[PDB]
UniProtKB/Swiss-Prot annotation:
Ways its activity is controlled: Inhibited by bile salts, is reactivated by (pro)colipase/CLPS.
Annotated active site: 154 (nucleophile), 178 (charge relay system), 247 (charge relay system)
Keywords (A to Z) from UniProt: Calcium, Disease variant, Disulfide bond, Glycoprotein, Hydrolase, Lipid degradation, Lipid metabolism, Metal-binding, Secreted, Signal
A GO CC term assigned to this protein in UniProt: extracellular space
One GO-annotated biological process of the protein: fatty acid biosynthetic process
Organism per entry: Homo sapiens
Protein family membership: Belongs to the AB hydrolase superfamily. Lipase family.
Name of the protein: Pancreatic triacylglycerol lipase
Length: 432
């Protein structure tokens, strides 16, 4: 069965669109009028209240603050959501802090609150609707599609994909924010977001858990030129409660990444396992791409598809983190305890991070990579301190004869100390 809607063309319920193991429920996309896809425009000149624009009346686009010399970014919400939800306009607001842009929020709440299998068909219409607006901008406003970026969350990721496919992959970029898994995982390229849908496609996975039983709203497999897996793409810090928490983290990390690019470097790595075990640090020669808003600044962004990148974030409060590798050479007496290091630089000082916990043998090197909640800057000094999990009555003293700190850029800073301190005493090392 097919339904056809004016200039959006026709839509079928035949495979791979329905009746398959991936998309079992046979259904057709609802009427464009029941879905009522709306375009809410925000510009640097009207940041607080939107301007409504429609593709079928170019006069609306011309009487608005839409600016043909600025890039255009669309934001599409997903399942059960609304284009009028604060996260959309707020993301636009962060953008306005760092650039001049036409920020368009796509409201398709008319079709997002349907049942899943229905909302999944509805995005076919929403996607065609987005593609038509881009088509009119190209055609009537001489605005090139390469100046377009579409950000989509959940079903919105695949919506961006439909729009990109209908625009023949000419869209500048598509960012998938935890693209939905059900009805899309393992479907052909025409159904789901894939590298071919835009010139550059960057994906942030934050809830890749298996829906049944682990309710992982997003998909585990790679769908872009560069797929980022913050915190392994599974259990985001701070999401022990709240059902949509891990799912909504992708929006939060992207939102914060507009103001804090440096706080989210992604490390090329085969897996999170290897990353956690110090095998994907520091950044490669060309640097690490910045997850989020500026991932497009990466030199080799599209030279290959499904490039995986790992990194960790905090649990709230801008989520930003900076990774360092510290190597400690022990001195003093052999005890059993844990050694901690603190970093001091011109920007600030990190907290103390356990490097090793066990048998501290003299002249034995112990490395550990950690994620600092502060970028220290150019390192000035480093502080050591160890604890004995058994106070040996001999008052043993341990020291660090040498401490090497390697930054994400591969730069090593050496620190030396001729002293040894007893348990729980801060030893400050100096440059050497
Ligand atoms: Ca596709």
């Amino acid at each position: 069965a097919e339904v056809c809607y004016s200039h959006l063309g026709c839509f079928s319920d035949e495979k791979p669109w329905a009746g398959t193991s991936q998309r079992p429920i046979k259904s057709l996309p609802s009427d464009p009028k029941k879905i009522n896809t709306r375009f809410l425009l925000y510009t640097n000149e009207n940041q607080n209240s939107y301007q409504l624009i429609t593709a079928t009346d170019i006069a609306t686009i011309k009487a608005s603050n839409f600016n043909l010399n600025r890039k255009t970014r669309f934001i599409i919400h997903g399942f059960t959501d609304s284009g009028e939800n604060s996260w959309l306009s707020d993301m636009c607001k962060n953008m306005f802090q760092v650039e001049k842009v036409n920020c368009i929020c796509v409201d398709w709440k008319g079709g997002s609150k349907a049942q899943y299998s229905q909302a999944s068909q509805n995005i076919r219409v929403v996607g065609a609707e987005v593609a038509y607006l881009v088509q009119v901008l190209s055609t009537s406003l001489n605005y090139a599609p390469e100046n377009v970026h579409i950000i989509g969350h959940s079903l919105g990721a695949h919506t961006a994909g439909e729009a990109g496919k209908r625009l023949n992959g000419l869209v500048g970029r598509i960012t998938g924010l935890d693209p939905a898994e059900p009805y899309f995982q393992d479907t052909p390229e025409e159904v789901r977001l894939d590298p071919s849908d835009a010139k550059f496609v960057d994906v942030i996975h934050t809830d890749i858990s298996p829906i049944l039983p682990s309710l992982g709203f997003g998909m585990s497999q790679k769908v872009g030129h560069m797929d980022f897996f913050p915190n392994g793409g599974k259990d985001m810090p701070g999401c022990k409660t709240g059902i949509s928490c891990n799912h909504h983290r992708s929006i939060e990390y992207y939102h914060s990444s507009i103001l804090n690019p440096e706080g989210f470097l992604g490390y090329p790595c085969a897996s999170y396992d290897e990353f956690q075990e110090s095998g994907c640090f520091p950044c490669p020669a060309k640097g690490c791409p910045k997850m989020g808003h500026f991932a497009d600044q990466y030199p080799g962004k599209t030279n290959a598809v499904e490039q995986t990148f790992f990194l960790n974030t905090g649990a709230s409060d801008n989520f930003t983190r900076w990774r360092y590798k510290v190597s400690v050479t022990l001195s003093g007496k052999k005890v059993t305890g844990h050694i901690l290091v603190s970093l001091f630089g011109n920007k600030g000082n990190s907290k103390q991070y356990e490097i090793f916990k066990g048998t501290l043998k003299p002249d034995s090197t112990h490395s550990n990579e950690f994620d600092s909640d502060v970028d220290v800057g150019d390192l000035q000094m480093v502080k050591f301190i160890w604890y004995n999990n058994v106070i040996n009555p001999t008052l043993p003293r341990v020291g660090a004869s040498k401490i090497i700190v390697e930054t994400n850029v591969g730069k090593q800073f050496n620190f030396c100390s001729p002293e040894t301190v007893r348990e729980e005493v801060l030893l400050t090392l100096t440059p050497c």
